[PDB]
Subunit: 123 residues, 4 copies
């Protein structure tokens, strides 16, 4: 079971901080703080993970969303990360993400950025 | 405010059904049922949306996650949709999505599918 | 063989025009004209397709690149489309695309947009 | 001008080898050899890059396509990489990619993988 492996504080290669609790039922809840972009302080996150992953050495699939509104700022956008948790001495959450921002219909072709973040327990 | 616009039952071009409640605080909660892939019946979803979007004609950014485990099936995978809600007579949620499935490290380069779903209130 | 099916003029849902010749060796060459974004008139495109696709009803994989520089404009960016050609009475090229624009290293997390275009022989 | 910077042999984090010539007109031509997946030996690649990039420290946008057919194997698929070249002592091509494989229409929702490769001149 990866409940204990996922729960806690994670850091990605940009210096962002991802604080998460994995519930026994597959829930992810916590906060996200981005070191880049139109963001400051913490934002609510929610997501889901596979709470009964394979036992063949495969990673644990998961995903979560942040909408970039909090009491300080509203960037009219949301990011979803989709990835897998890989436990062990150098545990990692390897993700790809989609950031959609609100646009008019004329500009909707240009409304989604894509990228990739790797999270570790150190740094 | 788009709380009332988002909450309810949505359908995409594959025949999938997305049932969601938008909370006043930006929460998305509900269930998802996929007409394709390794899925049957309903799965828990959670996500976030911008609860104070622009008023200039821009869409409302949002995102949500489904992990594909329920009491019937476990497909060791999770999908996140990232998109914007566009209200009106033919309201729509236009999304792009990432489906990550658990893999070994050797196969992780091939662990994420990408696609796009458009949800409407009819069909 | 889909050489004859692919070669010709295609249109996507934005009003863009894709003019392509499929070579017997798997080459794609032609021009692209975008109805949106920092673009005007025609841009060089090059790409590749599967010149011996399956015969089981599967689509024909292909992809191509446009760099958005021509004699009129330079938008310091490039788009790649990746998709499959599906022949018949309503033939189609269904794609997803990545648009990367030049950025500094500080802004590289935000350098790639993702989207999807569907091309038809009419419109 | 990045013609000289791009032309040559590149390696990504999977052990794949990308051999490319950048033409003065913005053309990319060469061969690709993948260390993973349904691939063996070299495949034709073609693409485009920005031949007059900004001079403000921004990367050089580019993209290319490989269709995974050669004299040995046909994997009925094509990958496009979209990214930017960043010159200097540790030059790099940072990409994201889309791999589409031929599918029936019923399976087309699952026809595209997405990932990210980083290429260097060493390794
Ligand atoms: O920047 C954000 C929110 C923070 C994103 C951080 C990302 S999430 C993925 C990656 N991983 C991280 O840890 N951090 C980064 N949203 C942009 C929304 N704007 C578009 C946009 C796109 C690129 C750069 C700036 N803006 C639209 C807009 C609406 C109102 C005002 C201003 N702008
Ligand atoms: O199919 C699913 C879950 C349902 C996805 C429906 C998508 S979500 C986006 C799109 N929109 C929709 O409404 N529906 C579709 N997960 C695949 C996980 N497997 C890989 C995979 C990839 C493609 C096809 C089948 N499998 C790995 C695996 C682990 C154990 C057993 C079997 N397979
Ligand atoms: O707009 C373009 C080129 C045309 C893209 C058309 C796309 S391709 C996919 C889709 N399908 C189509 O048929 N058309 C659209 N490049 C943007 C580069 N800029 C970022 C950017 C992002 C969004 C909107 C405007 N700019 C950076 C920049 C460098 C210098 C000056 C100005 N800007
Ligand atoms: O594996 C390939 C070609 C090589 C891709 C290497 C990628 S490109 C991006 C990344 N970067 C690299 O340097 N290497 C990797 N195509 C898969 C096509 N098949 C689906 C598929 C998906 C995942 C794994 C295996 N197959 C469909 C199919 C058609 C007929 C027979 C068998 N299979
Ligand atoms: Cu912004
Ligand atoms: Cu599966
Ligand atoms: Cu621009
Ligand atoms: Cu394969």
């Amino acid at each position: 079971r990866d409940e204990a492996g996922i729960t806690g504080t994670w850091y990605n290669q940009l210096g962002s901080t991802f604080i998460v609790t994995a519930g026994a039922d597959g829930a992810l809840t916590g906060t996200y703080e981005s070191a880049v972009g139109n963001a400051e302080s913490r934002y609510v996150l929610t997501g889901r993970y596979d709470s009964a992953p394979a036992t063949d050495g495969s990673g644990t699939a998961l995903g979560w969303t942040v909408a970039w509104k909090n009491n300080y700022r509203n960037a009219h956008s949301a990011t979803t990360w989709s990835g897998q948790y890989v436990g062990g001495a150098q545990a990692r959450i390897n993700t790809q993400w989609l950031l959609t921002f609100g646009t008019t219909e004329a500009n909707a072709w240009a409304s989604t950025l894509v990228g990739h973040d790797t999270f570790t327990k150190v740094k």
